Amino acid sequence: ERRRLYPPSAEYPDLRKHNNCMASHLTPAVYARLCDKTTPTGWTLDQCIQTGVDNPGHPFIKTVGMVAGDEETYEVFAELFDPVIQERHNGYDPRTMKHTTDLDASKIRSGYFDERYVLSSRVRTGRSIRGLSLPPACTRAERREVERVVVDALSGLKGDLAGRYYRLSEMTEAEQQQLIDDHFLFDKPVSPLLTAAGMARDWPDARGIWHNNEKSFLIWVNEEDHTRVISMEKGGNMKKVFERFCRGLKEVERLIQERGWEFMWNERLGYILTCPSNLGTGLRAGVHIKLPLLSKDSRFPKILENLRLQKRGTTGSVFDISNLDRLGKSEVELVQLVIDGVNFLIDCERRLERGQDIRIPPP
Amino acid sequence: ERRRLYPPSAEYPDLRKHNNCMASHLTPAVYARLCDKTTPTGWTLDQCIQTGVDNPGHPFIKTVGMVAGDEETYEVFAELFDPVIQERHNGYDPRTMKHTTDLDASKIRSGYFDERYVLSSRVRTGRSIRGLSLPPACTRAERREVERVVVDALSGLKGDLAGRYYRLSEMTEAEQQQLIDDHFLFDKPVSPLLTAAGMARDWPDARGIWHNNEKSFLIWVNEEDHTRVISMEKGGNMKKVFERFCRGLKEVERLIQERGWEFMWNERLGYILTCPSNLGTGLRAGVHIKLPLLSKDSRFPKILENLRLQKRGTTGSVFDISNLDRLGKSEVELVQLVIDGVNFLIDCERRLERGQDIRIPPP
Amino acid sequence: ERRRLYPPSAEYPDLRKHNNCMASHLTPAVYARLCDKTTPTGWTLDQCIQTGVDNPGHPFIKTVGMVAGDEETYEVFAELFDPVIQERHNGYDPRTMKHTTDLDASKIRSGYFDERYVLSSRVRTGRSIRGLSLPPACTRAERREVERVVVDALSGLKGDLAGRYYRLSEMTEAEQQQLIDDHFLFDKPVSPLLTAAGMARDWPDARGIWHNNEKSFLIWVNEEDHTRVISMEKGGNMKKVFERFCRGLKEVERLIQERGWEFMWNERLGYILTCPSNLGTGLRAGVHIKLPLLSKDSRFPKILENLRLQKRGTTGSVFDISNLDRLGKSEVELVQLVIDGVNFLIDCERRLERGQDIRIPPP
Amino acid sequence: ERRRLYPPSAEYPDLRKHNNCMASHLTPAVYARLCDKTTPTGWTLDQCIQTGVDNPGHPFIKTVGMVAGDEETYEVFAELFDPVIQERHNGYDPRTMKHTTDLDASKIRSGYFDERYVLSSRVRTGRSIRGLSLPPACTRAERREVERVVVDALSGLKGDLAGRYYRLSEMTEAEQQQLIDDHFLFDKPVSPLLTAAGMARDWPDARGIWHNNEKSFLIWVNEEDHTRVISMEKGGNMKKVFERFCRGLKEVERLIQERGWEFMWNERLGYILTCPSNLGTGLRAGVHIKLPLLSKDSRFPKILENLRLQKRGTTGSVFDISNLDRLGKSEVELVQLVIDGVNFLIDCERRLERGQDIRIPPP
Amino acid sequence: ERRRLYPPSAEYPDLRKHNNCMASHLTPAVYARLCDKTTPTGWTLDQCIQTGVDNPGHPFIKTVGMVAGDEETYEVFAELFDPVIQERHNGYDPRTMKHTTDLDASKIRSGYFDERYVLSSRVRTGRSIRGLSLPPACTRAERREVERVVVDALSGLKGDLAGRYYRLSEMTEAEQQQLIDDHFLFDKPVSPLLTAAGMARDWPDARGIWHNNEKSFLIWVNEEDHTRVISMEKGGNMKKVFERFCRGLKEVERLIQERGWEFMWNERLGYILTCPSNLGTGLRAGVHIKLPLLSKDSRFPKILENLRLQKRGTTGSVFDISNLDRLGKSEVELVQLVIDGVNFLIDCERRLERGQDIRIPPP
């Protein structure tokens, strides 16, 4: 018409007191360029950066501040998304570098941990369906559809990979309590970032938990991403949980492809997930390890950072140790790196108990 | 094209375990009719009912579960909004009945309260600018624009109605602390209903507080609605706060009309506000009254309900008493009703202290 | 799209210190309603009121402050234009009242003035072509087209109504000087209202003067309106100039209709002209009269206003006296009114010279 | 449809008696090509060349005759705009040559003038906001928005760069008179070129003057361009005014970028301004110098032209001397050139007072 | 866009020296109204009136000057077409009056003519297919389609109504010569009106002649209208030719309706034909009568006009006499009127041969 739209800079957010990657990498020129662009489904830049805008963040804990709604979001708004990935994934370049996926689990070697040192071992990743929007942008119908696809695929599961599916909509109090006792049930998201991103709409509609009979295979349906798969065990046996995880993943992929649905996947980004931090693989191979003597030493965080491992709470000297680079390295490579780090910390703790000096690994 | 959209019932929310007015008055036929409709600005039915869907509500505390984004929202989605107004406003009919606005304040009579019984008196309402979207749907540019209009209008304020404007974006810690000490500053919304409605996006951008020099006139800018105006005093003098409130309101209205902006207003709904519960007038004429003997009696809530008054916390026998019908009665009529109720409770407390029997007013 | 337009009140002009009819009759509601509307040709409300906005006006001299670009302008923007016509034409109502046109000139009676009292007599009106835009909105091609139509029509003029056409584009200095000596040439508009209205664009392209051989018929082509026709004579013989004017007008109308073009004309407005002040007829039947004794008396302006006559400069006691109501009365009725006023002033001056008392006519 | 548009040559203006660069470089082929093209905002070629068409110009004083409304105007209508820039900027080629901007002010050397010779020194340029239309095409809302952005940016100014902002809309008579006495206030544009270009619409709405406390920093808001910045002092100290100018410019740029707005800027054109004559830098570094003996000599204009300096009125042998090439050379390079010319004229005047012969500098 | 279309009066034809009904009933207002309108198929007003424009006509022989291209042409351009029908059909009013069709042929009574007086008798009308455009606007594909439909319908003809179909495209010279000898073949149209109307495009493509075995039934395919049907005989037996004509017409109509095609027909206009003169019925019941004594008398044309009969060449005192009102009267009524006129002329000639005086019938 003849009326004038608001200038692109008139919609520019106030990012003076923000400390997330979105605010750091957002410039007036990029916002002006990407204000008009829109994904085929309907996701806009403002909806992409709403989580970063509403949450200023805090120093010493830097977040991404961005979410995605579709596969096209990483392409329509690629100009802003690429530097965020660059800074979040230690310099990984989506412009030219190509991600490699290796989920065979036939390359895992050794990696058996001491039972006293390691109490539990987990392998966790996420997946999303290609034809349906991401949790920030998915409507109620699409959230029902992803649940239906996952339930239909997981119904045809046999062998040790056998279990049931519980819907939070009609979850009874007794089974809810037993799931809480098993530390498998997920609550309504309360983090301000998730709520601002729109990952808690329509709760608990279309949200479900798929539980294996052996209590080793866990599936969360559209709580933070379309599917969150976990293979866990009480002990230090990473090879068995890794092979169970890969068998379940390939079985689910084959079943959904047989039904006609396909996982989100791109050559340059890997497995597409809603949060740009979890990209490529989404793997967090964690370990609940108790190393009091090593935790006493102040050089322990530096040594952990040298091998690209991070520590988090479960404290009683028991911590969860997980890898860093979700994107840019193969899944089996990530598993090998995390088991190597765990073994290095195990022998360091053995030396500390014996009093032997520990050599710092190269960064 | 040739592809099929998701059926309107496929997007229908799961309202089996919801206890808000939105879920009560939502039917598959209405959702099917209003799924395609959209306000000129862009507000959809799903965005209208998202707050109700995400918040199931609780029995004995019934909420509306709906919000509006534009003036057209009450007209584009009128079919669903009308029964909600009907049930929320004690049977007020927006189909045929017309709201009457009387902000002259020249009809207030008597209504002077005892200083010992009443500690404070407040008159509070809300206003919104016609050309800009409501807080649930307003973008950053529109939230800046409403703030600019209000600040420009309130700059030209003289007499006793003189004060300053503090932006939460650059509010210093000392003045923030003094505002907290004055119980005037508003925090970031934490209620799940407000957050789900989208009333807490972009915080604290474009949010401000306008404070009178005499500490009697308070303006909140786009915290829950475009403008929240309060005239308060420490005592039981309702006529002075009412006249100050009306003078400020008419001065602001004249100033914005001089600048070219106009308040949202419809004949059938009154003053348009984002929440359908606050409609017509948005008045909450409150009183901080301490009636221990009356509070001891169990018939006190029934007596309060007879005169259409409600009690809320500030306890120490001190309660805030406010009117009920925001829409369907004139502003001066609401003030007269609330002062009549306060005087009735005052004489009831006097009788109780003297031991005299109290006659229950008709409902 | 998803971006937000500027609110209609954001474009509202600052009319605090304006004293034209446009500012007086412009309200935020009307501007909001008519901001989106646009004539088929392309004329907007802002272009209609630009002349009023740029020119604040002065007290004691009130202007219209509005212009039109097309015939649809009086219909597309009728809501704002109607009150302006109401106030400008002494209460004429375009909503219901219908204008009557009578250009026969067979009803003129008496109206012969004294040669000593009256030095000159003029009959002047304006016309516009239906298929072409008004001077404020007409482009260069349309301004060429109106000139071509008028020149082709006036070429086929015979009898006493015979003359030539001079284009200001190639007007030579000698004929320009002789036209100035004849007080017929028009200069480039310098009034701020006309320049702001856009009536001086592309000068002197497509502007011309058609001059009769007898120096009695004058045509101005698109200087302020499409055609400005004048029939003038040195004396007090109104019937001859009126009949010459009507003969020329009907001859030109018949010729243009023969060629295929038609004058702008509406039942409720009469002859459409660019300025809303000149509507219905556009007649200014003027007289250069010298009445020193009457001009000395201070009641002369009131007496002139009683008969609906106005005085203007040509002073030496010589003034131009013209009618007031362009719209709402028939052309012959306007001529009768002006000749009646002139005769009344003539007999008043005769009485003053003889010393006789003069009776004030009813208002 | 089936109806025929007016041919592009039917709209071609009559430029036979025009002597501006627009008429010189306008050809029927270019007009035919660019008649249909339109900037995203709505600026057409006819609106670009209206100023040239309405003003034929005069020999010995050649004007540009063109204006721009948007940043896209220099790209949508680049075919016509490029030769105008070529002829106006001494052969600068926007097709291939790239403009270089250097506003550091750390390269200025020497350039201190005698106090008796030089009475005042000024550094003046213009800036425009990227997201808002140029003054010829900007609507009322955009003119308000540019003023709001500039006022908000200049509010956060400290140090010696501290001052107030006066709006001409509510400028009181006393401060208006004192601004006139300071020769800082700007009047309503009366030049026919500016009025025809549309640079005087809506006066004095959204027009303001920002005045430093030290009376050295002057900002004009949307009088001829979005911002007109001046740093002036009474004396011959060019380095201090240059450093103050650059500090103010970079502070304002940083503040607007912090708020989210960005200055208009292109690699091939430099800083975008409405008039094509003022491009690249818009710098007019002037000096009020009194050289009677040099002014007596008839070779003085040639000597001034040799160094690319021009003379203008303030006469009493006092003239304002300013550079020529706004575009094609760096800002610091322009300052160095103008100070070199002033020093050359100073030593020439010293020689003339001493009677020494003066050597003519190379052209 | 922003460019201006040619005004509707700029396309107005020069009808000063035209004497057809189209020019008589065309006014600038009607042309302006109907310039934009267009039939669903694509027929415009200019194409409707091209035949009238190109052919000025001649006094004493007045033509219609209009053609139609579709059934919607009589409705889209009804405002201009209606007065033409009014004047052509002796005051028939298509606005309100409804045409009645009676093709039963069971109401014909008497009407047997003398063999010596009458040499031949013909009944001729035209028909058009509803789904295909009229000859002025029909393309090559539609002209092929009408021929295919007519040929397929007429193939299934038995009894005395049996014959062949000859295509002019491959008509051999011998059969062409024999058709010429039978005076049945039609040549390429040479009348300027038909050529200007577009009724001679693509000749002789899709043009054909269907000839009965008994040489009594003649069909012309898209020569001037879609179908031209004739039933002729050598003698004065009108009842037999009328019944043969009606039997053939109803058989063809039933056959085309069986195949799925339907004749053009409207309640207010009757059978739709391309030329507005031939409307309602298109009947021209002619008779080749030789009345020398009556032809000698000068009152014969007036007497013929009294009964609504017209005379035309075949002279040798032999003339073709036919009815006038194609539209407004029933087909059987037209046949009765023409046979009554022929019988009246027969008895008048008998009286003239016997010398008896003849009484003039009422007009």
Curated annotation (Swiss-Prot), chains A, B, C, D, E:
Phosphoserine modification, residue list: S110, S155, S191, S317
Q: Main location per UniProt? A: mitochondrion
Q: Which Pfam families match?
A: ATP-gua_Ptrans, ATP-gua_PtransN
- Which superkingdom? Eukaryota
Could you tell me which PANTHER family the record lists for this protein?
ARGININE OR CREATINE KINASE, CREATINE KINASE U-TYPE, MITOCHONDRIAL
Q: How does it sit in the membrane?
A: Peripheral membrane protein
> What is the role of this chain?
Reversibly catalyzes the transfer of phosphate between ATP and various phosphogens (e.g. creatine phosphate). Creatine kinase isoenzymes play a central role in energy transduction in tissues with large, fluctuating energy demands, such as skeletal muscle, heart, brain and spermatozoa.
GO molecular-function term, one example from the UniProt record? creatine kinase activity
- Which segments constitute the Phosphagen kinase C-terminal domain? 117-352
E.C. number: 2.7.3.2
Q: Which family does it belong to?
A: Belongs to the ATP:guanido phosphotransferase family.
Lineage here is: Eukaryota, Metazoa, Chordata, Craniata, Vertebrata
**Which residues does the record give as ATP binding sites?**
S120, S121, R122, V123, R124, H183, R228, R284, D320
Q: Which PROSITE patterns match?
A: PHOSPHAGEN_KINASE, PHOSPHAGEN_KINASE_C, PHOSPHAGEN_KINASE_N
Subcellular localization: Mitochondrion inner membrane
Q: Which miscellaneous remark does the UniProt record hold? A: Mitochondrial creatine kinase binds cardiolipin.
Spell out the protein name for this chain. Creatine kinase U-type, mitochondrial
Any Gene Ontology biological process: phosphocreatine biosynthetic process
Q: Give the keywords, sorted.
A: ATP-binding, Kinase, Membrane, Mitochondrion, Mitochondrion inner membrane, Nucleotide-binding, Phosphoprotein, Transferase, Transit peptide
Cellular component, GO annotation: mitochondrial inner membrane; mitochondrion
In its UniProt entry, the species of origin is given as Bos taurus
List residues modified as Phosphothreonine. Answer: T172, T314
